């Protein structure tokens, strides 16, 4: 039944909390969740931002009783494009995602020069595969309304939540094409 | 006049010092308005805590039963406490129209 | 050492004494600060009224203890 | 007393909870409510979401003593555009709001493919009567700031609250105007 | 579904709230409730009082999904001695609990003169069937610790919850035994 | 109406908070208060003690809408025996009660020797007029169960809540009759 | 003294509750409050809203035993922009704030019409003097995310809590500036 | 005077085993400082629970009355062969100024 | 390391929630927690009850960034009397606590019968080894104020949260000592 | 600063919790604490029992502000008879209180053959030095009203909280007086 | 035969006024199913609170011990309550098929 | 075995009626194993409450003293109750090898 | 093996010991680091006060366990 | 007239001034009590920083008003 691997889902909490935004998932999860619980998650993103909602989404997920819920979570996770988090939970092997923490830590550390030097509308097409589809729409939309810098900062937020094993390699390639003076700071091999 | 009798209990309380010679064991047979249960509970309090301290319970247990002030006034006369009994009756006929 | 003398009005005043002082001496020092005659002042500690005869050492009054002052 | 109608209101609690966001009522209700308890509701929406706020609104509604209140609630319902919830309560017949549940459910299951296929700025014009007037601009604003997808999402949350008896048919027809890729999924009869 | 009966239960909320203290039910209910939500109820009684706990008990009762629950509630009601609330819900006829309201009101207005005139250790014997078995010792304990008056007070709070259809008549008769000074105030017919 | 002197009731909050225990009052207040609000107050006494409940009783009192509530509070306050708090609010002159703060402060300051030296069952009869009737039952009952010291400490709590203008004089007289080495510490003129 | 003013403060507590939002004041009050108590206040706004937080804020104020606390509170009100509540409490004369009540009651039952026919962003600049300058930032932001209506409704909330003696007057000017269709309604 | 009394009760409690031999009924008439109210109480306890069980209460009750230590000495002389009298006597004098 | 144990601690978080009441532990944990966070934990017990407080307690634990926090927590469990939860978490073997589940489920549906037929005050002394010695004081006090029944019901709550491997066994002994009429429900 | 004491005091918060019952102390504290929150300590005592009250009493002690408080607490402790807890927190050396644990454990362990065999009114007169004076009163009454056995259970609770360095030696002398059947169990 | 016993305590409660003549102090030695604790507890209650008030506790403690009804009859018989004892014996046999 | 003594008390309680002839006032001089206190308490309790009601206290006070059954066997036959004393004799011996 | 000692000043200094070290040893190593006399030191483990005679192995003190340090004041 | 000046060390020292006193005067009186240079002193009133030129009457500073003192660090 549901017990023996729920434990495993709890031990890997940290990874789900970091990569997931429940917003894109919840549309699929509608059968397993109370209507009010969805809205609560939705509200916690709005108020405290995606992680805070993820932590709350995690909390309700583990409270789920009616069977089939585990496959239902993965199924959603797949359709949303979180494949590679899905890939990871399916094999219970997070090695793939863990490798990313180095480059994720890096970007945080040079995050200021990313803000300055990156023009997102340039490199979004190449990065389109590393980000959730909806995250792109949100980014280019910020670019229009709040400016290039404000958009880069949002591209950084999303790059951190990305679970695609190769994105730091993806990004590098994008930065070598149309070349933004940040291209030099980012190093993979 | 149940109104006047409750106002009397108040007097016994301000002036409780005046009732110190009332003996519960002795006066309980003269107070049939106190029930089997009432008498019994007072006797017990009286064995354990002594008379004088039970006395406060005696009156508190009385004021609850209707027409106690009559029963009590006549009770006090039964114990040869008439000096006091005349004191209670005076206060009692005082507070009633 | 020091001891605090708080009136019941809440006004607290610090006093320099040592365990060997009598209560007469404390009452004397009470006068030098607030200007109160010692015959009119009654001191309370641990709900006990302090006898003029005895000493701070007898009542286990120690550094930073708190005495209450009434008229 | 006013208890006759206060009880009957409790029987239909579930329908009110699921169709109503008190925020759009509260401007009308301001005279019958204590100043605090209105600010409490505003927060429970803001914190736990509309439903949870409607649930609190109801707690406070039944607490009202001085009369004209039941009518004032109905009057508020009507003026806010929640007409048909108002139809239901005055008649104590919810059959119209209940037949909706079929399509409320169906829209939920199609929610992902809705977000992808639909551009809300197109069909908002036509659904104007199905949604609270505020919800219209509340959505279009989400469109310009967070992008089309996040705005489609809201359009769906609002549609599920809609108490207008025909809205699923209005939506199909609104879809019938331009070639969709959602329209095939959406079937009213 | 189980929604048929879940709704009807909501219609009679007021009667359940005012007759019930979930604490005396919860031992029986323990299998259908999550471990937390039982401790929540225990606190809302302990903090805000029995009624407020009954209100929360009801929120959680309707949340129950897996069946046998409605019956398990009824069965709990019966075994706890809340019979006659049980009578009411199984029959959906509260007329018996409603006719009580007259005397529920009257006992309230006489509450002070009840506290003064009454010794509860006398009439507790006779009301044993009108009160929950725990409420009996809950009261006698208040008697020995806080004195007769505080214990009379409790006897009154418990009597107002009593769902036994005849309790006002049982109390008069219980009063008819010994000469009271309350009995004249208390009039059943 | 209720506004102009509500203000005054608020200014003198401190005095009601200090002298009132809502327990003895609430039996009368039953018409003006919600049933749940009574229980909440009752709970707050039980949990945090009388003052805490008084502050919460105050809170609800000022929220009262339906007219006649002000006389109803005074009316209860009178019947309970809080005459002199009643006397004070009725003339809005608290000078009488304020004089007590000196002797109230004093007792707090010699409270330890009161605990040691006072035998309550001696002086309760004389003090019976300074204390609420129910407070006496509670005190003698503690004496029986927890001992003379425990009882004196309870007599002190209740003497502090007393509003009777003369009690420090009353107490002195009682202490001169049957003379408990505390008799000397207590001084009035 | 310290007790006399608590009463005076407690008497008028109603006006404080319906005017003040403690979150905007607590910045100037930095010396008097424990971090524990300010997070408790901050929480009550976020959960039960500004009034509830003002009510709590008052509890902790009268609970403060330190020196100079009454003065510390009034000095905060003035610098925070709650002046006119400050002017009122220091003179123990509230008549100014009270004449406002008529218009608060009016705005309340005209609120629906306001909600629709007002574009807040047009007039915020002009009535900025009536509002706590921090409140303005919330509004312009509600506007940005939730649309004119949701924002207008917030402008109402802040206007009700406005203690400035002239606000209804300065609202009408601002409303006459921008040909609003709500202007008449709104009569002074 | 009374500072010394406090310390004398505290001495009776340290050394309580010494006093086991005071008989309550026999010592009571020698102690006028005990209230009319007090003696009634004590006799009840001695009646129900026996002598040695009353003793803690005898001493507990005495210490509440002013001047008790002077009388209690005198009691132990009258009720006894005096040795304990001389015990508490010497202690009580230790703390006189 | 510090991350490896967070996971191991997070996996078994279920057993901690259903065993622990943080209020009894926090005394031994004095070096690790802010006064703010303790009062927040203390409040969640008082309001939503022990489980909820354990659940919150865990959040702050994993939130603690300082050194030696895992060790600090286990060292508290042992001294606090929660040993056997301690024995279990340190060996990452919960099988001992798990065999207890059968009897926890049993007690749960026998609870009504326990509530009536048990006089707690008779057997607390004997089963004291199963309970946190602080829990015992709450029970004897519930007994005193609210009567045997209300107290017996509390004794159940604490027994459920007992992590001692032998409690059901030591309950049966205590039950056989005082011929209880509940004994021959309870079967080991 | 006074913080030297607050931080120091709560490092030892666990011993305080286990020995003190704030109620016997509270009379001396009446000047330093608000009247409310004295009424709270008394209440937690009455609901959850002495420990839980001590845990609360402490909370409010560390919140205390005015001059002379820490000494005020000590003076209360010594005058109330808690001497040796007083000794301990003045010298910040608890070794005396901890040494007792050996014997605390023992008394808990023989609790049943206590209470069944010996009657409290036999030995309580001799134990006057081990117990707070008020604990004697309170026990003797529990003996009278709730029965002797219940009285022994309370004598034990008091003895376990006792801070008198020698109490187990004093106890052995006390019950050595009459031919017992508990005496050979008790060994130093 | 434990089922019937519950129906019997219920009878003693509905009809409690019928047992008013039972005296706790006398009947206790004849109730061996009552534990050492129980004897202690009830005797103590019968002190402070008197007999007729203690009764409701005597019965409420008994019905918790197994087999009480059997024991309780020829308790009541040993105190020569035989009329009543017959009352109880009859009602007890009524609930077993 | 000392345990055998405890099982002997348990018999006195199981069959009490057998011991109802015992006279407390008469048997006390034959129980040197009863202290000053034990006798005083019983003598006061026998005075106040009468004989038969004190017997349960007599036996409960004895079982607390080690080796009591031998003193009781002898004391009982010291009262010419020897029929009873041999009843007790069989059972005491029964619980040791 | 390692142990943390946390003062009340809130500053934590780690020190190197082994299970066979005594408590007087740990006080000494605290002296060699923070320069505070072993007379003024009281060491707390899980709210138990450590005796100067005994050893870390006795108290079940472990790797990365934490001792609480109070001063004479 | 009276004014409180509260340091960050949490200790509050009261000083005697009148409305016509300047801010440089208040800094001086702080110097005569706490013995700290007026160069190192920054004084805050309701979170406004006081200018050395001006006077208490200007800032609307009143009886029992409170100034916040920060140091040079």
UniProtKB/Swiss-Prot annotation, chains A, D, E, F:
Q: What domain of life does the native source organism fall in?
A: Eukaryota
Which sequence positions carry the modification called Phosphothreonine? 170
Gene Ontology MF terms = ATP binding; ATP hydrolysis activity; double-stranded DNA binding; double-stranded RNA binding; GTP binding; identical protein binding; pattern recognition receptor activity; RNA helicase activity
Phosphoprotein as a keyword of this entry, yes or no, is yes
- Modified residues annotated as Phosphoserine in this record: 8
- The record places the cross-link (Glycyl lysine isopeptide (Lys-Gly) (interchain with G-Cter in ubiquitin)) at 48, 96, 154, 164, 172, 181
Q: In which tissues is it expressed?
A: Present in vascular smooth cells (at protein level).
The observed outcome of changing residue 55 to I is: No IRF3 signaling activity. No effect on dsRNA binding
Q: Which modifications occur after translation, per UniProt?
A: Phosphorylated in resting cells and dephosphorylated in RNA virus-infected cells.
Might you name a Gene Ontology BP term for this protein? Answer: regulation of cell migration
| Reported induction | By bacterial lipopolysaccharides (LPS) in endothelial cells. By interferon (IFN).
Upon changing residue 8 to E, the result is: Complete loss of MARCHF5-mediated degradation
The subcellular localization recorded is: Cytoplasm; Cell projection, Ruffle membrane; Cytoplasm, Cytoskeleton; Cell junction, Tight junction
The CARD domain, residue ranges:
1-87, 92-172
- Please tell me one Gene Ontology term that the record gives under cellular component: actin cytoskeleton
Modified-residue entries ((Microbial infection) Phosphoserine), positions = 8
Q: Impact of mutating residue 164 to R? A: Reduction of ubiquitination. Reduction of INFB induction
State the UniProt keywords alphabetically. Acetylation, Antiviral defense, ATP-binding, Cell junction, Cell membrane, Cell projection, Cytoplasm, Cytoskeleton, Disease variant, Helicase, Host-virus interaction, Hydrolase, Immunity, Innate immunity, Isopeptide bond, Membrane, Metal-binding, Nucleotide-binding, Phosphoprotein, Repeat, RNA-binding, Tight junction, Ubl conjugation, Zinc
Q: Which family does it belong to?
A: Belongs to the helicase family. RLR subfamily.
Q: What's the protein here called?
A: Antiviral innate immune response receptor RIG-I
Q: Which organism is it from?
A: Homo sapiens
* Whole-protein residues included: 1 to 189 of 925
Swiss-Prot record, chains B, H, K, L:
Superkingdom of the source species: Eukaryota
Q: Where is this region: Required for interaction with NLRX1?
A: 10-77
Q: Where is the lipid attached (S-palmitoyl cysteine)?
A: 79
Which tissues is it found in, per the record?
Answer: Present in T-cells, monocytes, epithelial cells and hepatocytes (at protein level). Ubiquitously expressed, with highest levels in heart, skeletal muscle, liver, placenta and peripheral blood leukocytes.
Where's the CARD domain? 10-77
For this protein, what post-translational modification is recorded in UniProt? The phosphorylated pLxIS motif constitutes an IRF3-binding motif, leading to recruitment of the transcription factor IRF3 to induce type-I interferons and other cytokines. Ubiquitinated. Undergoes 'Lys-48'-linked polyubiquitination catalyzed by ITCH; ITCH-dependent polyubiquitination is mediated by the interaction with PCBP2 and leads to MAVS/IPS1 proteasomal degradation. Ubiquitinated by RNF125, leading to its degradation by the proteasome. Undergoes 'Lys-48'-linked ubiquitination catalyzed by SMURF1.
Record-listed N-acetylproline modification sites? 2
Where is the crosslink of kind Glycyl lysine isopeptide (Lys-Gly) (interchain with G-Cter in ubiquitin)? 7, 10
What subcellular compartments does it reside in?
Mitochondrion outer membrane; Mitochondrion; Peroxisome
Role of this protein: Adapter required for innate immune defense against viruses. Acts downstream of DHX33, RIGI and IFIH1/MDA5, which detect intracellular dsRNA produced during viral replication, to coordinate pathways leading to the activation of NF-kappa-B, IRF3 and IRF7, and to the subsequent induction of antiviral cytokines such as IFNB and RANTES (CCL5). Peroxisomal and mitochondrial MAVS act sequentially to create an antiviral cellular state.
UniProtKB/Swiss-Prot annotation, chain C:
The UniProt PTM text for this protein says: Phosphorylated at Ser-65 by PINK1 during mitophagy. Phosphorylated ubiquitin specifically binds and activates parkin (PRKN), triggering mitophagy. Phosphorylation does not affect E1-mediated E2 charging of ubiquitin but affects discharging of E2 enzymes to form polyubiquitin chains. It also affects deubiquitination by deubiquitinase enzymes such as USP30.
Name its species.
Answer: Homo sapiens
Positions marked as site (Interacts with activating enzyme): 54
Looking at the record, the residues that make up the Ubiquitin-like domain are: 1-71
Annotated phenotype, changing residue 68 to G: Loss of DTX3L-mediated polyubiquitination of histone H3 and H4
Q: What protein is this chain from?
A: Ubiquitin
Point out the cross-link Glycyl lysine isopeptide (Lys-Gly) (interchain with G-Cter in ubiquitin) in this chain: 6, 11, 27, 29, 33, 48, 63
List of residues that carry (Microbial infection) ADP-ribosylthreonine: 66
- Site positions for Essential for function: 68
Spell out the subcellular localization from the entry: Cytoplasm; Nucleus
Function field: Exists either covalently attached to another protein, or free (unanchored). When covalently bound, it is conjugated to target proteins via an isopeptide bond either as a monomer (monoubiquitin), a polymer linked via different Lys residues of the ubiquitin (polyubiquitin chains) or a linear polymer linked via the initiator Met of the ubiquitin (linear polyubiquitin chains).
Question: By which gene is this protein encoded?
Answer: UBA52
Domain of life, per UniProt, equals Eukaryota
Q: Which residues carry this modification: Phosphoserine?
A: 65
UniProtKB/Swiss-Prot annotation, chains M, N:
Cross-link annotation Glycyl lysine isopeptide (Lys-Gly) (interchain with G-Cter in ubiquitin), location: 6, 11, 27, 29, 33, 48, 63
Where in the chain is the site Interacts with activating enzyme? 54, 72
Q: How is it modified after translation?
A: Phosphorylated at Ser-65 by PINK1 during mitophagy. Phosphorylated ubiquitin specifically binds and activates parkin (PRKN), triggering mitophagy. Phosphorylation does not affect E1-mediated E2 charging of ubiquitin but affects discharging of E2 enzymes to form polyubiquitin chains. It also affects deubiquitination by deubiquitinase enzymes such as USP30.
Q: Which residues carry this modification: (Microbial infection) ADP-ribosylthreonine?
A: 66
Tell me what effect the entry lists for residue 48 to R.
No effect on HLTF-mediated polyubiquitination of PCNA
Where in the cell? Cytoplasm; Nucleus
Q: Which residues are annotated with the PTM Phosphoserine?
A: 65
User: Which positions does the site annotation Essential for function cover?
Assistant: 68
Report TM segments. none
| Ubiquitin-like domain boundaries | 1-73
Known outcome of mutating residue 65 to G? Phosphomimetic mutant that can recruit PRKN to mitochondria
Free-text function comment from the UniProt entry:
Exists either covalently attached to another protein, or free (unanchored). When covalently bound, it is conjugated to target proteins via an isopeptide bond either as a monomer (monoubiquitin), a polymer linked via different Lys residues of the ubiquitin (polyubiquitin chains) or a linear polymer linked via the initiator Met of the ubiquitin (linear polyubiquitin chains).
The protein's name: Ubiquitin
Which organism encodes this protein? Answer: Homo sapiens
Encoding gene (name): UBA52
Query: Which stretch of the full sequence is covered here?
Result: 1 to 73 of 128
């Amino acid at each position: 039944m549901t017990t023996e691997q729920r434990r495993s889902l709890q031990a890997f909490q940290d990874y789900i909390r970091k990569t997931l935004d429940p917003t894109y998932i919840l549309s699929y999860m509608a059968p397993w969740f109370r209507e009010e619980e969805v809205q609560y998650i939705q509200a916690e993103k709005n108020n405290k931002g995606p992680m805070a909602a993820a932590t709350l989404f995690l909390k309700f997920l583990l409270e789920l009783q009616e069977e089939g819920w585990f496959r239902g979570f993965l199924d959603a996770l797949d359709h949303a494009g979180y494949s590679g988090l899905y890939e990871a939970i399916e094999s219970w092997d997070f090695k793939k995602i863990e490798k990313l923490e180095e480059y994720r830590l890096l970007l945080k550390r040079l995050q200021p020069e990313f803000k300055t030097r990156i023009i997102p509308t340039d490199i979004i097409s190449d990065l389109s595969e590393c980000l959730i589809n909806q995250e792109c729409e949100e980014i280019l939309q910020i670019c229009s309304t709040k400016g290039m810098m404000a958009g880069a900062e949002k591209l950084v937020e999303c790059l951190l939540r990305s679970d695609k094993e190769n994105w730091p390699k993806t990004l590098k390639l994008a930065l070598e094409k149309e070349r933004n003076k940040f291209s030099e700071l980012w190093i993979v091999e | 006049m149940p109104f006047a009798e409750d106002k009397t209990y108040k007097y016994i309380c301000r002036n409780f010092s005046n009732f110190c010679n009332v003996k519960v064991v002795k006066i309980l047979p003269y107070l049939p308005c106190l029930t089997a249960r009432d008498q019994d509970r007072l006797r017990a309090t009286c064995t354990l805590s002594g008379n004088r301290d039970t006395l406060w319970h005696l009156f508190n247990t009385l004021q609850r039963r209707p027409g106690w002030v009559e029963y009590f006034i006549a009770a006090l006369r039964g114990c040869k406490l008439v000096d006091l009994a005349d004191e209670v009756a005076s206060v009692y006929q005082s507070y009633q129209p | 050492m020091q001891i605090f003398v708080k009136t019941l009005t809440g006004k607290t005043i610090t006093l320099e004494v040592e365990p060997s002082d009598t209560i007469e001496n404390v009452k004397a020092k009470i006068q030098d600060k607030e200007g109160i005659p010692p015959d009119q002042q009654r001191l309370i500690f641990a709900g006990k009224q302090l006898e003029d005869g005895r000493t701070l050492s007898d009542y286990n009054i120690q550094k930073e203890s708190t005495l209450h002052l009434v008229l």
